[PDB]
């Protein structure tokens, strides 16, 4: 925003977000590599 | 299909239409003669016979009671214009004598224009200062331009926004009031006026910036804001005192700096 | 325009190309 | 690291990813389709 | 100094090459030295494309056709009678053009004016030298490219049609055409407007911007305005010519084939099949 | 740096504007007004309001009928599956009645007979739209030159519609309802009549078409360039000439050697415009009425090129 | 109940009403004379 | 978490939010029915 | 659950969900006639 | 409830509630006409 | 004669009989370049 | 008679006289090299 | 002569003969490379 | 009744009536002559 | 070197740094797909 | 001699001057590629 603070409670916010989301993605990428890999 | 020997009903037609069509680009000519017209000579002056294909003078019935216009009756521009031929051809250009700004040559030229102001339909005046509007106000998501510095061509600051002009039929802003570090007001035509600040991509842009909010006049230098022509009536111009501050500004892209009249090279 | 004349691109499309 | 936020506004930046994010997903979902390998609902 | 209030605007400068070498008018046009390079490339164009046809068949103006190089001739500079004079009049008129814009941009700075016309002169241009220029050397041959002929032009844009199957399908070519449609839909409503306002009936006065306002907005619903009819005809132009440049330039090079079939896409979408 | 002209910068907003008052007797406008932030970045951000007088009625729901109509055969056509709608719509079209029928006014609905209907409502909904721009630029005491240049694209809307079908008395010859059905009835009608080429009123429809495109360009390019001294205020300009006339009319004058009026430059713009579809109209009447191969029709007036001429084999070798 | 004439104009009202009933009746009439059952005049 | 509703307006982002599910619900329902091992009434 | 009225305009609401509901329902319509299993029309 | 109408103007309701129903009638016995077995002009 | 230059600025004069001068000899030699018997570059 | 120049500028007559002279010599040169009767380049 | 000075600038002169020039030997240069007598590049 | 007068123009009325009844009698006009039955002019 | 920082303004230089990025990584992977050796999701 | 700097700047010279310099070497270089004798690509 615009004092360091809010900047980062913003970025804790981001982060924690985008850690969850990756996360999901991984677990998401990898029951696909189960599944079928495509690198052969 | 013939209608007789090799002539034919498409092949009639056609020729039917091609004579049209002169006809059209004939009447068209004559339209296009009602103004400037009958020519002259570069260096006495005389006067041109006139075409055979002319018909009668075009009379229009201006509104709020202004009576005929007659195009062809415009008064013609004095053969003596204020500058001196570069070399004695009847194709050489003109070097002004003096402040081609002041005088009126080239691209700072004006007309002489009708002394009254344009009104609406009702008869109001046309251009206004935006507190004399009738609840004209500016969008609310739009710059606001109020107390905005105003930076000239030579990238100085010549003074601030102190007043918007609008139009009271077409609904823009025509022009800006200007004070100037001297305090004298001048009228900046809206059209020579780039806003900086509000650009839509940087908007679009998901940025944080303190992007400088001001006007930048270009046309013309900071002390040439002293020389724009003035009003006669407060809160009301003409459409002479509009053509004169037209031509003063747009001049100045060719006579503000020498550099500007110079080719690139 | 290329480096080649027109009858050295019309010789090498025909027995170049057209002809083997 | 936080001060990437003194720059870019939090709003507009979110909205943008968001939308850049749904565009990119909604490319590689349909790409995975045309494929006969990665399809999932043509055959059992 | 021909019109009568012509002799105040006739100064120098406002030139961008040359000064004031050939900064002068001769009768009304005014030359500056994009005008004698103009002069030049054009006039040597045309008697060049009379050269050409009097080595032709015939001299009947119809079917005079300065025709490119074969297509086996690939880019190489031809003979002049075997497509040579094609090649040396397509840089004679890509010379003129583009002097024809520079000259345009110099007498909008003699009076004061931006560079509008320039630019939308040469959106056209554009649209000429990738029909003649750029398409035959993306494609590979100069053969490609259209004939000088008044009716053997109009025999290249039918066969370049009907080599694509049915040249209707072409997406491009759609949206360029929906603009040249909207232009002169557009033109005879500015046009009609203008015409109406300043010719009155009934006896009335000169009509006020108010009235156009009104007629429009009594017509359809709503009114684009003074300004922005102009800007909207000048968007529609130009983008009528670039579009016509694009759909041109992408087939022959991108798509080869029918473009009937490239709408088979449509039919594969899995929202509907 | 420097303001182009191309986007306002800033807009004023206000109460709308309900327009002059009537010189006839009008019943009275429909109050429903809107403001739109991006149209008034180009033009003026203003909707509305709306005038719905006799002839606005008759238009509007007769034209609903006739859209109605051929919506309704493109889901029959379709199967009523919103899917095959979607998948089909290019190529869903409600189709003239055979030859085998003639010009007769009954036929089977599913046959034609909807297309004679939805032909007939959108005919009555044109010439009633045609009454309403004639009535309105009466309302106010202007001229009737956009009546004309409606007339004219009327004109050619009703030659490929009812005329020439009435003339050729088939049916079969008019232009179906479709988008790509359209399309593939402009490219038979070429090539069942020779090449539409070599009629010499296509050629002079495409001249005109062609000119207008340049005369728009040209002539919107010349009113933004002339922002700077209010060349958009053109009733102002042809009633009182300011700087900005004399300007437009010298540029042209320096480039061209000739020059229009502020007034004289519109009336080119409304010929243009006019004789396009005019041009257009009389070309298609007589395709197939008085002439039926158009190439022959050039071979006999000397401007019918053949293969000596040129050989467009390399172009067509060259798109494969 | 006569009330509604408080808030549609009869004369606005008279007009809609009557161009829906011209389109309407010309459908009718139009569909009838697409059917040779109820075509009265093609045959005696 | 809730500081979100601070940087983001809930009136239009829940239309936003409830327009695009819409569209995409429609959209996965419809690709399910152009398939034939989903569709579900076609066959008995 | 009543705390979605007084800033989410009801005109605008109801207005929006009875146009998707209309949209949705004439889809579903149809689709069910376009099938020949539950065409209702055709046969007896 | 009658206060319906106090967020509804009822002039533009009736309106689009009578063109609504118009095209819903239109569409209704176009589909009707258009089956053999609900077609009630083609035979006797 | 002299009095030619009564009538016509040497500067116009010069560049436009210049202009011919050159579109002249470029349209001499092309010509002459484009038969066989005046053709000097393409045979010994 | 030397009085055709009190109506017509000899500095405009010269230069449309001449624009015409060359348009047609070089309009009649062009037709005499079309006709392999008058051609004077072709063959020897 | 050297009065040719007084009525032509240098500084624009020069740049307009290099132009000139520039575009004369680029013509002159390709017409060689269209003859297989002077080609010097497609073989040896 | 005469009431009829004060709700509608006689002069507007007229001709939009007149004008109904011009396209109402041609049209009725070109379809009897379009038939077989009832043309009067090609047979006698 | 830091110093550039002074010439540069780096929201403005991000955005269209990470704008070329995409547009470059978008063109790599298309390309790499049209490729058969480097095609990861045609066959396995 | 520097005289010509006094009448001629710098920086539009040289920016002229490279912008020819660029597009003579590119169109040089082209012209090499496309004959077999000079291409140094497409054989060993
Ligand atoms: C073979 C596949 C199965 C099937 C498999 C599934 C699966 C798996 C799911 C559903 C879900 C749903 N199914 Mg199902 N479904 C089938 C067949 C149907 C049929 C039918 C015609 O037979 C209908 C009407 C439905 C309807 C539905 C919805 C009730 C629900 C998705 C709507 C939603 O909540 O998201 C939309 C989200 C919103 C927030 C709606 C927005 C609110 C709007 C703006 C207000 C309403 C206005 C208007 C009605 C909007 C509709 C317009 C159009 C949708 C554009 N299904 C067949 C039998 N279905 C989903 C579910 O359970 O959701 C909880 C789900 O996960
Ligand atoms: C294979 C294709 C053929 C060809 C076959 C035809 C045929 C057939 C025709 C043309 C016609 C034209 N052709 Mg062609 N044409 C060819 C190639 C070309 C090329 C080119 C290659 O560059 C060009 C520039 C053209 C250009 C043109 C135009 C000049 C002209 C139509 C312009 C017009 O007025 O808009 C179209 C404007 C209208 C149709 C007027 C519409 C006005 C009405 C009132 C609008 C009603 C709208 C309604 C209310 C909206 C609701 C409707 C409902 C949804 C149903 N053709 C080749 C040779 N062409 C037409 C013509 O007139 O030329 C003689 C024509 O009939
Ligand atoms: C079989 C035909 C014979 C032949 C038979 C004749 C006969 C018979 C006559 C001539 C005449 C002329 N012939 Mg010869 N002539 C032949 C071949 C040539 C060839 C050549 C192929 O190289 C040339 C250059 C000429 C040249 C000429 C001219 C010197 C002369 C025309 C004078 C004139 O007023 O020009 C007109 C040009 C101008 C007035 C303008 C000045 C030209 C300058 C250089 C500018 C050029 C303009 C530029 C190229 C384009 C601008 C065009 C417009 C102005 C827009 N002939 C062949 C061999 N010729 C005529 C003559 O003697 O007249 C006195 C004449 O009666
Ligand atoms: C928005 C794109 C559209 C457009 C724009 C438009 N046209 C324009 C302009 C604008 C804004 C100008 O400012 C300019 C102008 O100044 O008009 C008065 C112009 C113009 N548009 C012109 C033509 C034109 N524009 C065309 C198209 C279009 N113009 C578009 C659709 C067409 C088509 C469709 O073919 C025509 C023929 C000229 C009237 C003028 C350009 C004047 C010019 O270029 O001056 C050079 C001087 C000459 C004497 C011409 C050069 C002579 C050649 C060297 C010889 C001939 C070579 C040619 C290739 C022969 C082939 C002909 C065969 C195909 C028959
Ligand atoms: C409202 O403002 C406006 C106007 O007036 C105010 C307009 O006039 C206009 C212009 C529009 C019109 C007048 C309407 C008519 C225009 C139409 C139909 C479109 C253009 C099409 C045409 C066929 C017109 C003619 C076009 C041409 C290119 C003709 C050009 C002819 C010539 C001879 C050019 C010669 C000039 C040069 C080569 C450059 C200078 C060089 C020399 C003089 C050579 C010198 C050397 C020697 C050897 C003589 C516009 C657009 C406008 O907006
Ligand atoms: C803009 C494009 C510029 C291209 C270069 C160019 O346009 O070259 C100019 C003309 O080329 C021409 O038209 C002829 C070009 C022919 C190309 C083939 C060269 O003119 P100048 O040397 O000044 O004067 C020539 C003298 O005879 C004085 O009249
Ligand atoms: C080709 O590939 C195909 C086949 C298409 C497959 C690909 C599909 C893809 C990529 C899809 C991706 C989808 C996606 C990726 O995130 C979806 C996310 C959905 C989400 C996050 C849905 C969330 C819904 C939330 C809802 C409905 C919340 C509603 C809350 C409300 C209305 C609360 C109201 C309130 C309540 C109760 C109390 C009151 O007093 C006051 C108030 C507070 C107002
Ligand atoms: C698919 O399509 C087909 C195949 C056709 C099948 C479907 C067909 C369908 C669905 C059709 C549906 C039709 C329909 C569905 O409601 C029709 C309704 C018709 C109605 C309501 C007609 C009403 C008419 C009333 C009339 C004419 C009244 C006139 C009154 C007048 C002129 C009064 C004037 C007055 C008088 C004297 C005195 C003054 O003091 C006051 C004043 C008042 C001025
Ligand atoms: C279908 O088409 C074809 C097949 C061709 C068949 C048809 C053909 C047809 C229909 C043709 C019709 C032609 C026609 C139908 O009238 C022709 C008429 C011609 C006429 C009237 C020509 C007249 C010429 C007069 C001339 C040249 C006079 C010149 C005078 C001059 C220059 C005097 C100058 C002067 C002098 C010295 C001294 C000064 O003090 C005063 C001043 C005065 C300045
Ligand atoms: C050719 O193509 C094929 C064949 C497909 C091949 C190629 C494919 C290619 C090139 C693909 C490239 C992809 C790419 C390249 O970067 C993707 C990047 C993705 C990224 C960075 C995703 C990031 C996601 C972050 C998320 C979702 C964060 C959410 C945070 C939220 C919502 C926080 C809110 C907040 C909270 C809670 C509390 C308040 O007090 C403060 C506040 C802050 C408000
Ligand atoms: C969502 O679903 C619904 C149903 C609600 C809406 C559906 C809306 C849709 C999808 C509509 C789609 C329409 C489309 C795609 C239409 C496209 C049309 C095109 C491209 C047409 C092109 C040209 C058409 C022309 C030129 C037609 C001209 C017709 C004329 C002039 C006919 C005249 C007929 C007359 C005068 C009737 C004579 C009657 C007679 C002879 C009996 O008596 C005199
Ligand atoms: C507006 C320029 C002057 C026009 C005068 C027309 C007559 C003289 C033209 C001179 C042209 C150059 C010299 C002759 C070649
Ligand atoms: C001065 C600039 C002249 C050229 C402007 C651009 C022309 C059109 C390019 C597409
Ligand atoms: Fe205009």
């Given at each position: 925003y615009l004092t360091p603070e809010e900047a980062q409670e913003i970025h804790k916010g981001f982060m924690g977000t985008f850690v969850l989301y990756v996360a999901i993605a991984l677990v998401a990428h990898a029951l696909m590599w189960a599944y079928k890999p495509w690198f052969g | 299909a013939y209608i007789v020997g090799t002539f034919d009903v498409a092949e009639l037609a056609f020729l039917l239409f091609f004579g049209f069509f002169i006809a059209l680009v004939f009447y068209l000519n004559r339209e296009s003669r009602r103004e400037g017209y009958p020519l002259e000579d570069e260096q006495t002056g005389k006067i041109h016979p006139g075409s055979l294909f002319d018909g009668d003078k075009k009379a229009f019935q201006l509104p709020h009671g202004r009576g005929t216009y007659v195009p062809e009756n415009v008064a013609r521009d004095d053969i003596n214009v204020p500058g001196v031929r570069s070399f004695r051809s009847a194709g050489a250009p003109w070097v002004p004598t003096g402040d081609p700004m002041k005088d009126?040559?080239?691209?700072?030229?004006?007309?002489?224009?009708?002394?009254?102001?344009?009104?609406?339909?009702?008869?109001?005046?046309?251009?206004?200062?935006?507190?004399?509007?009738?609840?004209?106000?500016?969008?609310?998501?739009?710059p606001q331009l109020i107390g905005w510095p105003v930076m000239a061509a030579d990238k100085k600051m010549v003074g601030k926004v102190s007043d918007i002009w609008v139009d009271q039929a077409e609904h823009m802003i025509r022009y800006l009031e200007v004070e100037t570090t001297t305090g004298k007001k001048v009228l900046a035509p809206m059209m020579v006026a780039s806003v900086h600040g509000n650009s839509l991509i940087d908007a679009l842009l998901p940025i944080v910036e303190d992007k400088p909010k001001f006007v930048e006049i270009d046309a013309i230098t900071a002390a040439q804001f002293e020389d724009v022509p003035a009003l006669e009536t407060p809160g009301i111009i003409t459409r002479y005192e509009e053509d004169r501050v037209q031509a003063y500004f747009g001049g100045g892209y060719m006579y503000a700096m020498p550099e500007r009249a110079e080719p690139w090279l | 325009c290329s480096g080649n004349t027109a009858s050295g691109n019309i010789a090498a499309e025909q027995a170049a190309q057209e002809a083997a | 690291?936080?001060?990437?936020?003194?720059?870019?506004?939090?709003?507009?930046?979110?909205?943008?990813?968001?939308?850049?994010l749904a565009?990119?997903?909604?490319?590689?979902?349909?790409?995975?389709?045309?494929?006969?390998?990665?399809?999932?609902?043509?055959?059992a | 100094a021909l019109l009568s209030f012509e002799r105040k605007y006739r100064v120098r400068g406002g030139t961008l090459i040359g000064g004031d070498l050939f900064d002068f008018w001769v009768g009304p046009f005014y030359v500056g030295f994009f005008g004698v390079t103009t002069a030049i490339s054009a006039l040597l164009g045309t008697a060049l494309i009379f050269a050409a046809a009097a080595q032709g068949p015939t001299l009947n103006p119809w079917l005079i056709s300065i025709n490119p190089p074969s297509i086996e001739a690939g880019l190489a500079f031809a003979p002049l009678s075997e497509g040579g004079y094609w090649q040396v009049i397509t840089a004679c008129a890509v010379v003129a053009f583009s002097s024809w814009v520079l000259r345009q941009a110099e007498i909008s700075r003699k009076l004061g004016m931006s560079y509008?016309?320039?630019?939308?002169?040469?959106?056209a241009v554009f649209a000429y030298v990738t029909l003649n220029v750029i398409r035959p050397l993306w494609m590979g041959a100069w053969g490609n490219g259209f004939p000088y002929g008044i009716w053997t032009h109009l025999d290249w844009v039918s066969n370049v049609g009907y080599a694509?199957?049915?040249?209707?399908?072409?997406?491009?070519?759609?949206?360029?055409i929906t603009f040249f449609f909207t232009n002169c839909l557009a033109?005879?409503?500015?046009?009609?407007?203008?015409?109406?306002?300043?010719?009155?009936?009934?006896?009335?006065?000169?009509?006020?911007?108010?009235?156009?306002?009104?007629?429009?907005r009594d017509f359809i619903g709503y009114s684009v305005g003074t300004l922005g009819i102009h800007r909207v005809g000048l968007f529609l132009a130009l983008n009528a010519g670039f579009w016509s440049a694009i759909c041109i330039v992408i087939s022959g090079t991108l798509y080869v084939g029918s473009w009937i079939e490239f709408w088979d896409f449509w039919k594969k979408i899995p929202i509907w099949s | 740096a420097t303001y182009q002209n191309i986007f306002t910068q800033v807009q004023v907003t206000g109460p709308?504007?309900?327009?002059?008052?009537?010189?006839?007797?009008?019943?009275?406008?429909?109050?429903?007004?809107?403001?739109?932030?991006?149209?008034?970045?180009?033009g003026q951000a203003q909707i509305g309001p709306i005038y719905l007088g006799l002839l606005g009625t008759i238009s509007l729901t007769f034209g609903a009928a006739a859209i109605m109509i051929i919506g309704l055969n493109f889901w029959a056509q379709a199967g009523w599956s919103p899917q095959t709608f979607m998948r089909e719509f290019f190529w869903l079209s409600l189709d003239p009645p055979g030859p085998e029928y003639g010009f007769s006014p009954f036929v089977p609905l599913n046959e034609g007979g909807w297309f004679i209907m939805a032909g007939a409502f959108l005919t009555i909904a044109v010439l009633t739209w045609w009454a309403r721009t004639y009535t309105r630029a009466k309302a106010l005491g202007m001229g009737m030159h956009i009546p004309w240049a409606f007339a004219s694209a009327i004109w050619l809307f009703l030659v490929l519609g009812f005329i020439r079908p009435m003339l050729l008395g088939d049916w079969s010859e008019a232009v179906p309802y479709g988008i790509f059905s359209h399309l593939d009835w402009t490219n038979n009608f070429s090539l069942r009549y020779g090449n539409l080429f070599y009629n010499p009123f296509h050629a002079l429809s495409i001249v005109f078409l062609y000119g207008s495109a340049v005369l728009f360009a040209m002539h919107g390019a010349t009113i933004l360039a002339l922002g700077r001294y209010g060349g958009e205020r053109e009733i102002e300009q042809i009633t009182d000439r300011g700087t900005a006339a004399e300007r437009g009319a010298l540029f042209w004058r320096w480039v061209m050697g000739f020059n229009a009026t502020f007034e004289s430059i519109h009336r080119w713009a409304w010929w243009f415009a006019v004789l396009t579809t005019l041009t257009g109209g009389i070309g298609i009447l007589i395709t197939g009425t008085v002439v039926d191969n158009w190439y022959l029709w050039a071979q006999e007036h000397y401007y019918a090129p053949e293969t000596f001429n040129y050989d467009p084999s390399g172009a067509i070798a060259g798109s494969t």
């Open positions: - | 009126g040559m080239g691209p700072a030229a004006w007309a002489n224009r009708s002394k009254y102001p344009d009104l609406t339909f009702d008869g109001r005046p046309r251009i206004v200062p935006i507190a004399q509007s009738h609840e004209l106000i500016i969008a609310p998501n739009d | - | 690291m936080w001060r990437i936020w003194f720059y870019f506004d939090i709003r507009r930046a979110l909205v943008a990813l968001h939308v850049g565009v990119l997903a909604f490319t590689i979902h349909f790409i995975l389709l045309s494929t006969d390998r990665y399809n999932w609902l043509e055959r | 509008h016309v320039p630019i939308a002169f040469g959106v694509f199957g049915n040249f209707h399908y072409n997406p491009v070519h759609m949206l360029a033109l005879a409503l500015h046009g009609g407007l203008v015409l109406s306002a300043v010719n009155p009936t009934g006896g009335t006065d000169v009509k006020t911007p108010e009235y156009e306002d009104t007629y429009f | 709308p504007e309900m327009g002059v008052p009537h010189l006839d007797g009008s019943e009275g406008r429909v109050e429903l007004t809107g403001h739109n932030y991006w149209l008034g970045k180009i």
